[PDB]
Amino acid sequence: PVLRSVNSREPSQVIFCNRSPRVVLPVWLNFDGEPQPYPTLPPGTGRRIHSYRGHLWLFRDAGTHDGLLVNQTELFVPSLNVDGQPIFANITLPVYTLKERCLQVVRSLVKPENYRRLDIVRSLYEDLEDHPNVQKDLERLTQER
Amino acid sequence: MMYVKLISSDGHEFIVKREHALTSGTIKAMLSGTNEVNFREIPSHVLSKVCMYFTYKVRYTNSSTEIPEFPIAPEIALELLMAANFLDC
Amino acid sequence: MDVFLMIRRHKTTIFTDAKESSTVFELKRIVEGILKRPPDEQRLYKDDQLLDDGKTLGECGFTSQTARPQAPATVGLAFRADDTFEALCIEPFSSPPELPDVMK
Numbered sequence: 001p002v003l004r005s006v007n008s009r010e011p012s013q014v015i016f017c018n019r020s021p022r023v024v025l026p027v028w029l030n031f032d033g034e035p036q037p038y039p040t041l042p043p044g045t046g047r048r049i050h051s052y053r054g055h056l057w058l059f060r061d062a063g064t065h066d067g068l069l070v071n072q073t074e075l076f077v078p079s080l081n082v083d084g085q086p087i088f089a090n091i092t093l094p095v096y097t098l099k100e101r102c103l104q105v106v107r108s109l110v111k112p113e114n115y116r117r118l119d120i121v122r123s124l125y126e127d128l129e130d131h132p133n134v135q136k137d138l139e140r141l142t143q144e145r
Numbered sequence: 146m147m148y149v150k151l152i153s154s155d156g157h158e159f160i161v162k163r164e165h166a167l168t169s170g171t172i173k174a175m176l177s178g179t180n181e182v183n184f185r186e187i188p189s190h191v192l193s194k195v196c197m198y199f200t201y202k203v204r205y206t207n208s209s210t211e212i213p214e215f216p217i218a219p220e221i222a223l224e225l226l227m228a229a230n231f232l233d234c
Numbered sequence: 235m236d237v238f239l240m241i242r243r244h245k246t247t248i249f250t251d252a253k254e255s256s257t258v259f260e261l262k263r264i265v266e267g268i269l270k271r272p273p274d275e276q277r278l279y280k281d282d283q284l285l286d287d288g289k290t291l292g293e294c295g296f297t298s299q300t301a302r303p304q305a306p307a308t309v310g311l312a313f314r315a316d317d318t319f320e321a322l323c324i325e326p327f328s329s330p331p332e333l334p335d336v337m338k
């Protein structure tokens with residue numbers, strides 16, 4: 001795959017800072033490009049973690065897999081530590097579209113078996129079922145490279 | 146600021162900045178199709194929330210300051226989704 | 235600090251922002267630009283309470299905490315019809331429908 005961690009073996013200390021109201025799932029892209037989940041971060045909590053230069057991370061809502069931002073972008077790559085200072089990973093909500101935000105709230109309230117029963121145009125029904133998904137997003141991100 | 150008027154199906158008039166309303170490609174087209182727009186299909190409890198979204202989005206796009214959740218009450222979520230789809234917001 | 239407002243009269247609602255330090259009178263100037271009624275033909279309210287021209291929005295209780303982009307604070311507006319002021323009136327928004335079964 002194109003999006004994968006480089007096996008640098010060069011330690012990089014990182015702070016995962018969760019400045020979102022979501023439970024955050026950190027996801028490491030391993031050396032084959034397969035997404036590997038890591039332990040979750042409660043809202044407003046921090047964690048010191050040991051990673052490596054050239055490693056790829058992205059962050060999701062643990063419950064729903066909604067995309068989150070890290071340093072105002074999607075992917076975080078640990079870099080060189082200056083004066084032993086860990087790299088801050090600021091995890092934030094994006095500005096979701098009004099449509100996506102509505103989709104999130106409706107999915108949170110309605111069992112997926114019942115989407116078809118909602119009184120909406122069929123195109124919006126297809127949009128509810130097409131949940132956020134790491135596998136989907138890497139294809140998009142890989143092509144935009 | 147130049148303002149524009151957005152009118153809900155029940156006759157409520159929401160007056161918002163022009164710059165804010167052009168966030169919506171649909172509204173931009175409706176205004177260049179004048180500075181007032183009528184929405185036969187969007188009631189005031191939905192259109193009011195849409196206007197708050199404009200304010201919210203303009204405030205927080207490209208902001209390092211931590212972003213709060215855009216709140217949507219369940220009762221209106223369904224109608225707001227349909228409006229967002231139409232307005233492409 | 236910016237404060238985010240809805241200025242409401244009858245079936246009219248203006249979305250605008252202002253500085254915490256700006257005055258009731260300066261907000262009337264905003265309304266004048268939009269609704270073409272001079273400050274002196276305007277009354278502004280917090281809930282039922284008439285606001286004084288010279289006071290800041292902060293002192294009237296519009297703060298960044300309470301007057302947020304996604305939840306703006308409401309200012310009531312009443313016009314002086316010719317001689318005398320109408321009572322403050324504000325139409326509520328429409329009522330949402332019942333939650334569907336599959337959402338309850």
Ligand SMILES: Cc1ncsc1-c1ccc([C@H](C)NC(=O)[C@@H]2C[C@@H](O)CN2C(=O)[C@@H]2CCCCN2C(=O)C2(F)CC2)cc1
Nearest residue numbers: 007008009016026028038039040041047049050051052055
């Ligand atoms: C508690 C918690 N909350 C949120 S994350 C978290 C958390 C928990 C444990 C860790 C552990 C100590 N470190 C890692 O897994 C780092 C993070 C990323 O670089 C992948 N990797 C690694 O350590 C990878 C993958 C596992 C085998 C070794 N490895 C290497 O590259 C080598 F050297 C060449 C072999 C890191 C974070």
